Symmetry: D3
Subunit: 241 residues, 6 copies
């Protein structure tokens, strides 16, 4: 292995320059099986990687695990192997009343409620997606005729307090996040997730292209939906090779 | 009679306009409006000079913002109060990337928040991101003109001198925060420096207003008639796709 | 033709002036200059309109700064380059203290830095403090014409609306940082709100330049003026040559 | 399931109140095997959980995955399931020249170079470990004679720039972290890892007890990347905390 | 005269002392020293009153720090310059937990840094953590002496009033940052308020010096706005 | 009897005094009081020693604050509860500007907040500015006595060592924030370093209280030579006489 965590070598990628990065390692094979010649490459910790082919071009599918920290490792090591385009596909919960389950959300930029993004750029720097990737995702969503929302996403380092969930062990939410969801809602924020701030910041600050698409599973205010998101990320990827 | 505190305009004055092209200099407002139908002057107070024109039968506003986010925040706010929901920033800029040559066009996806006004609308964590439809229209319009375009991040500074790490000043000093900052932005891929986008993009993206920005490169510190016109044609053409 | 990038001025144009009165509105430059000897127009570029006059045989400059710290930082810097060492800001303002009435004169000793430009010259810990000689001249000048004067702190905001906690706006909302802020400033003794002093005072105090500010109260939120404020700033200038 | 991610019910715990939480899901079974009646419970995403018995008391072993975000989910849902004491067992990069690979490091408190800890307490709050847990870990290491070092640990949200590793795609480190390792080193910080700040903060600020121990796999004063004593210790320590 | 700027002490004055007990009140220095052998007054400048004493045949220093991290930072630094490597702070404190009673002894593992001096030694991310050996000696000493002991986090404030959300003041107002802070600390398990541990603990932990802290409860905020001493001495005994 | 928790004073003790001179060292209190009429010691608790005296027939308080903003905040707060509305801090300091000589007098208009207590009264954006009347009284008093005066900004640090970028210490290191800071403050025109003004000026300016600050330069961080053993003594008397003279104008 040429990289410490993934257990992958440059040869394993077979020239691949684009990678689809879901958070769950169990979703890796499912995405790869949607393309040609899917082949499992490795599995270490939360990182499960597969190689497939799209229109004769090698593409990688590698899980990131939950959170910016594990995500930063996968992105960094994939970049070291040659990947220059990263497309995250995920599941999410909207915070806008009009966003229904099954809807597709394409992130233009993210509210940085994480810590890893700061390890690549100061807070003043925008966690913005790559224009081409975002365009590819929006056009792919339209292609399959999905109800799509394009906008800002709040990317939190936590699933509970950071997303202002009170049904917890302590039921306490620290001052910083007390009342935050309503704030985000009034600011037009679409949803909450836990990896985009890190992904988008480390990519945009190092000349790497990154996009983000997610299917709405729940609304604070899967099968078929996740299927949609997955089809969309694969079709978008096809336009970025 | 005016509905707002600074622009000296009434909603009636806009005639249903919902989109405004917002250059910084009031002496460029008429030139921009002149490219459209029925260009009529509306008002001028301070650095806020406004004109109304028509694009494919739809009224459009061209209003200057002045220099800086503070001045820009007043114009955008009051225009929003008059009915404007889409803002297209047009300008000329330098560049901090070697591969960007004079005459190229820059379309900004998001900005580095090196201002103060943006924080009066959203915390620093919030992205000073451009609207997707506006950015798309600008990129498409630029492409139709065959212009060499660069799409990326811009650094929006509250100062023309230290915030852009200029040492050719009275003090010849640059505060710690900005010492060595230009090479950092360059390494992060930042395309250029300008002084109003962080405020514009942040206040719009956090208030349900659509915003985008396009600029013509007139100078490159690492190394303007025609360049300005192209940018202007692009912003007007983009507005056409956003009406 | 020009020794500076924006003002359109040369050192010759100043004729040795070391003092500049800096109102925000270009429309007030001529009026202020009119109170002195041999007033003459110099230049006008963007929001920067300058005039030169004479007081007691010494050349004086009156130059507008426009609205906000960004344009103000450009005017101050370029005037400093031309030889200006003392800056006196004159303006009209809206008080936030119940007992500061319209017609009253405010002399700022220091400002609350709710701007962004000041930070491009000194870290937040540094005081946006006015120079003592300037403050003294303004106070004494105000006394000479019998104005009801208030000497103290001013809140300097990068915005006219949210930063001054105004809700009569399009969104009708004020970001967390500023929600409930006016009441706090009031309880802290802050006299008023304006938008240029934090930048002016911080950049001058941290670069060996002298600066002060006086304003006439023309309105009060907790419920001829301009001519007197102008008289005061010109009278104060005389004492600083 | 009583929780959203772990796929467990309180019954699966069998009265367990202490959880040994490694980062690597492949280390869970290895840890459970050193105890009685080891039984696999579930495996979803990066959260692999096993149950074991120590001195006749049910004990849980659950992986957290890499980083504070993943860790905060595991800790929270395990807390909802009834766990009150957490003992993290991990691997780490030493930053002091005298620390050898294989040495066991017990963390008293962590430098919060993460983001999730801020979701439980402001930066002013110390990411301090529980005294009983730290005592048990030190006492357990003393009982098996392992080379042990007790002190502060720097817990980073990244493996690369936050730990000032330059052997990367960009080869650059943001201003905030340039020269940071030398600084921590001069301050006595023993090592780098990526979960303790979050773990210790969320536990100390919510009435939960937490201990932190890790084995050295690389010495940063020499290289950025390398070419069971800590485990024995974490298990022994748990025995003292039942 | 003196090898240091403020304390007015010479290295020879310490007679080899490597541990110092540091109370806040200079008036308690003599009393604490009186609990050991051969107590000799050394100096008295500002709020820095110091005595030397002997414990199990080893020289020990008792030096007041005055109130606050700034004053404390000077005492600690200059004592370190003279050879002290272990600092045990003993103080009075106000509990913010209802189960903690007046007369109870508190041992601090780490402190909430609500001060400014700690930032002059380490950024805010760094923990104001106590030394493990020192904390252990304090806990073990508490058992020996016999006292209702509580071991946990302490909030160290740069002020006695607003920073501890006290309203019995001239203005009667508390700045935004501290409005409602006490119940926040309380919900987080913080045991008490005091004003020197954040600075002491941080500057020692980040400079290779051992520090520990114990305090006696003299009031409970959930109600109103000698053990400890015997414990710090017995603890010093275990650390010589 | 005591109306306050630390000072051990009662409003009666003040005899109507509304102004207080606040030096840092409790041993200096008696010295400053000696420049006025009928000085009498009031109390002494911890680093808080207080005396009452008469100035032009009006009661005035002299009370030490101790070192740093924390103890200073207690003294100022409790003296305020007792009725004091004006505070004049007098100190001895080390300058950081080459042109400021030993023996010179410094009057602080505002301070760089390198402390922590000031934040317990106002957020960092708020200026640690001195009251205009007090500053005017100090400047005019310096002129009456006839000293070489400098009027400007002061860096108020929570530490005597790293915060003032001193390397002659046990660890010999200075944390990142203060590394190269003295040079930055010098270029910004900061006159000196001291340890109580940020707290004192901020807590007073944000609570309707008047505060002034004057100090005598006993040493210069940029010069080689160091004042005999009478570094303070003569220079200290200079500043002391100036703060008393200034007080007379604020009664
Ligand atoms: O409330 C929700 C619902 C779903 N997600 C979320 N918040 O952020 C989560 C991570 O991206 C990932 C971790 O479960 O799933 C995203
Ligand atoms: O330098 C090091 C060495 C080891 N670890 C670390 N930093 O944090 C890492 C993750 O928890 C996990 C995967 O790297 O191992 C921990």
């Amino acid at each position: 292995s040429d990289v410490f965590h993934l257990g992958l070598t440059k040869n394993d990628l077979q020239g691949a320059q684009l990678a689809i990065v879901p958070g769950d390692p169990e979703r890796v094979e499912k995405i790869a099986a949607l393309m040609d010649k899917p082949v499992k490459l490795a599995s270490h910790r939360e990182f499960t990687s597969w190689r497939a082919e799209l229109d004769g071009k090698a593409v990688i599918v590698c899980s990131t695990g939950i959170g910016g920290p594990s995500t930063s490792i996968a992105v960094e090591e994939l970049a070291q192997l040659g990947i220059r385009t990263f497309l995250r596909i995920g599941t999410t919960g909207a915070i806008q009343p009009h966003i229904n389950v099954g809807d597709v959300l394409v992130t233009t930029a993210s509210v940085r409620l994480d810590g890893a993004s700061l390890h690549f750029a100061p807070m003043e720097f925008p966690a913005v997606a790559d224009f081409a990737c975002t365009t590819a995702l929006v056009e792919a969503a339209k292609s399959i005729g999905a109800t799509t929302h394009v906008g800002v996403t709040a990317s939190s380092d936590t699933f509970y307090p950071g997303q202002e969930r009170y049904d917890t062990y302590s039921g306490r939410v620290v001052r910083r996040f007390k009342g935050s969801m309503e704030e985000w809602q009034a600011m037009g924020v679409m949803n909450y997730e836990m990896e985009s701030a890190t992904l988008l910041t480390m990519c945009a600050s190092q000349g790497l292209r990154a996009g983000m698409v997610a299917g709405v599973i729940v609304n604070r205010t899967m099968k078929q939906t996740e299927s949609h998101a997955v089809k969309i990320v694969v079709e978008a990827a096809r336009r970025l090779l």
